[PDB]
Amino acid sequence: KTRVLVVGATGYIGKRIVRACLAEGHETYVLQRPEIGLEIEKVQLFLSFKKLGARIVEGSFSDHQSLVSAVKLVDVVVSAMSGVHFRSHNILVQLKLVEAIKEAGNVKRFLPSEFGMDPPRMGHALPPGRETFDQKMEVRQAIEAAGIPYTYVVGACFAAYFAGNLSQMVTLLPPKEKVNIYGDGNVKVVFADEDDIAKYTAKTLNDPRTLNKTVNIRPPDNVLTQLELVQIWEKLTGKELEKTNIAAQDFLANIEQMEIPHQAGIGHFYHIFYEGCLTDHEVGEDEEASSLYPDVKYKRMDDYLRMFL
Amino acid sequence: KTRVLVVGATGYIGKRIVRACLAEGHETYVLQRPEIGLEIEKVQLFLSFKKLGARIVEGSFSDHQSLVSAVKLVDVVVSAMSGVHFRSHNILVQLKLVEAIKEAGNVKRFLPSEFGMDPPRMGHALPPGRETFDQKMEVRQAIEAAGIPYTYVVGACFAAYFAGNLSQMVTLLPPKEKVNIYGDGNVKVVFADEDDIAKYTAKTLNDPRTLNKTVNIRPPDNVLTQLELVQIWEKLTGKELEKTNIAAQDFLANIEQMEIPHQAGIGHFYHIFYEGCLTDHEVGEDEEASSLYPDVKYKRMDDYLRMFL
Ligand SMILES: NC(=O)C1=CN([C@@H]2O[C@H](COP(=O)(O)OP(=O)(O)OC[C@H]3O[C@@H](n4cnc5c(N)ncnc54)[C@H](OP(=O)(O)O)[C@@H]3O)[C@@H](O)[C@H]2O)C=CC1
Ligand SMILES: NC(=O)C1=CN([C@@H]2O[C@H](COP(=O)(O)OP(=O)(O)OC[C@H]3O[C@@H](n4cnc5c(N)ncnc54)[C@H](OP(=O)(O)O)[C@@H]3O)[C@@H](O)[C@H]2O)C=CC1
Ligand SMILES: COc1cc([C@H]2OC[C@H]3[C@@H]2CO[C@@H]3c2ccc(O)c(OC)c2)ccc1O
Ligand SMILES: COc1cc([C@H]2OC[C@H]3[C@@H]2CO[C@@H]3c2ccc(O)c(OC)c2)ccc1O
Structure with missing residues (x-):
């Protein structure tokens, strides 16, 4: 034992x-x-x-x-x-x-x-x-x-911090009508309960x-782009969300002026969703x-x- | 329903x-x-x-x-x-x-x-x-x-804040060797899970x-003095604890100089264990x-x- x-x-x-x-x-x-x-x-x-x-x-x-x-x-x-x-x-x-x-x-x-x-x-x-x-x-x-x-x-994003919120920052629930997509939303991310x-x-x-x-920890069915994750939710709810694509430069703009725990969060989301660090190897x-x-x-x-x- | x-x-x-x-x-x-x-x-x-x-x-x-x-x-x-x-x-x-x-x-x-x-x-x-x-x-x-x-x-003290700590302040666990008794410890209190x-x-x-x-909420078997509470624990453990009796004015001494949350705690504890407010009627x-x-x-x-x- x-x-x-x-x-x-x-x-x-x-x-x-x-x-x-x-x-x-x-x-x-x-x-x-x-x-x-x-x-x-x-x-x-x-x-x-x-x-x-x-x-x-x-x-x-x-x-x-x-x-x-x-x-x-x-x-x-x-x-x-x-x-x-x-x-x-x-x-x-x-x-x-x-x-x-x-x-x-x-x-x-x-x-x-x-x-x-x-x-x-x-x-x-x-x-x-x-x-x-x-x-x-x-x-x-x-x-x-x-x-x-x-x-x-x-190797995996905690699902509570990245999937239950459709990867929206400062929230832990799905949004009601609008969602921010990081870049084209075609970068693969690893998610896990x-x-x-x-x-x-x-x-x-x-x-x-x-x-x-x-x-x-890279369960193959949980390798999803942010748009794939969003579309799962749109299918489950029967409702399309209004999506705004956020370019890398605008996501990071004025990062240096924000409070430090938020600067860290932004840096991490950038590696995960813009550089695709969890799937680039x-x-x-x-x-x-x-x-x-x-x-x-x-x-x-x-x-x-x-x-x- | x-x-x-x-x-x-x-x-x-x-x-x-x-x-x-x-x-x-x-x-x-x-x-x-x-x-x-x-x-x-x-x-x-x-x-x-x-x-x-x-x-x-x-x-x-x-x-x-x-x-x-x-x-x-x-x-x-x-x-x-x-x-x-x-x-x-x-x-x-x-x-x-x-x-x-x-x-x-x-x-x-x-x-x-x-x-x-x-x-x-x-x-x-x-x-x-x-x-x-x-x-x-x-x-x-x-x-x-x-x-x-x-x-x-x-009408009842929450068990976790008053029973599981043998009513010692700033802790939520039974003390290992020494216990403070408020007054004679013969003032009836009401405890409830x-x-x-x-x-x-x-x-x-x-x-x-x-x-x-x-x-x-006054369950009759749960109306107990602090000494009766401590005696339950001592019979569960088989070990007698060293008891120190604290008189009213020593319990309240210099209360005006402590943090406000601690002051309120002492006031509540005074009313419960020294005045018996839960059982004086x-x-x-x-x-x-x-x-x-x-x-x-x-x-x-x-x-x-x-x-x-
Ligand atoms: N998406 C992802 O992949 C995520 C990764 N993580 C990573 O998971 C790991 C755990 O994070 P998380 O679960 O949120 O952490 P918690 O913030 O829930 O803290 C975990 C434990 O840290 C102990 N702790 C905190 N400070 C001290 C201290 N000074 N001294 C001794 N112990 C301390 C505590 O031990 P105790 O139980 O004894 O009190 C606490 O419960 C981290 O490496 C994190 O970076 C976390 C979030 C998302
Ligand atoms: N031994 C005893 O008899 C005890 C009696 N009590 C009494 O229990 C009752 C509840 O106390 P307790 O369980 O410790 O409560 P908590 O400290 O757990 O707070 C209970 C809820 O208060 C809500 N809350 C706090 N601030 C706000 C706010 N500004 N705006 C809206 N909602 C707020 C929250 O609701 P939300 O969940 O929606 O976030 C929170 O979960 C109290 O009257 C207390 O005095 C408490 C401890 C011991
Ligand atoms: C949901 O909103 C936020 C979440 C985060 C949570 O992603 C930054 C953090 C955090 C959770 O712990 C995440 C994280 C931390 C260390 C890692 O290695 C990690 O890998 C995915 C993920 C920070 C800021 C936010 O606004
Ligand atoms: C265990 O240590 C403490 C507990 C208390 C807990 O007793 C004061 C408080 C508190 C719990 O919520 C208790 C209380 C609050 C309102 C009440 O009406 C009450 O009646 C018993 C009891 C405060 C300070 C402490 O050091």
């Missing part, structure tokens, strides 16, 4: 990873930091994990020895640390976890908080969006310096095929999660969008 | 009320406000409501006619508006809901956001905690000046017995929810506390 520590267990993807580890059959440990005082939602999340059979491990990122103690309990550590500018962007805090793993020496694999664009492929991104890739690379740098075996889970991301993570974390590998079946784990009947984006009807 | 609208549907008690209305068989509507921007957890709560069978109603408190349109759809309106200083304390925003109910004319009953201490009994309270009772009384006044029929649900509070709400909101009444079976709805097998605190072992 694989023992797994989830660090970031109440996070957006972290909580889905916890439940996926439990359903996969792993002996699932969750790190509970003691600073969560009156954050009642976090406290009841941990209590719901307990009721599912998770085991709470108390530890703190400012107590190096408590991290060492926690990781010594498990075979695999999965980190879901924050990495979104408008939420919180504390990627580099994992360095203390890496150090703790380095000292414990028992850890057979570490999955750091990746779950998005492929960091080493983003060397061209400009600040502040660039921070995400620079800081994940630095965590990668520490992992491989320490000789810690790893798996990097990358976050619950499937979690299930692929639970399955890959002890799979020899993915030891010391980048694993890509091919990946093999031996490094792609839908083909590695074909028993995951992943949710297609028409079924994902139906939830919004 | 009673048609119910919940305003505050993603709130702490609000989401529990939505689910209990659905389980009770009400045709349940929930107000989705448009300023839900990137608050993904709210967005996904509504999706979870829809799948359980709730109907989404769009409206904004800054758009009076949207509110009138919403309350027109239902027979009863339940408000779970915020009212905790360290969370947010927007009780007075319900005045706009009351005004829309007035104009609509069809609402058979309105339950405002109370769910705690009985406001008219708290006239002696001092600021800032006093604001809770004053604003809840201003809402009561506007309800009655509009002729809207009502039910006021009051918040899912039972929601079930009673769902059961009372169309009950002829409770039209234009105050309904008290009696209520008939006619107006108490556990006798009113005896098929609700309310969770006793020993079972509640087991979630924390």
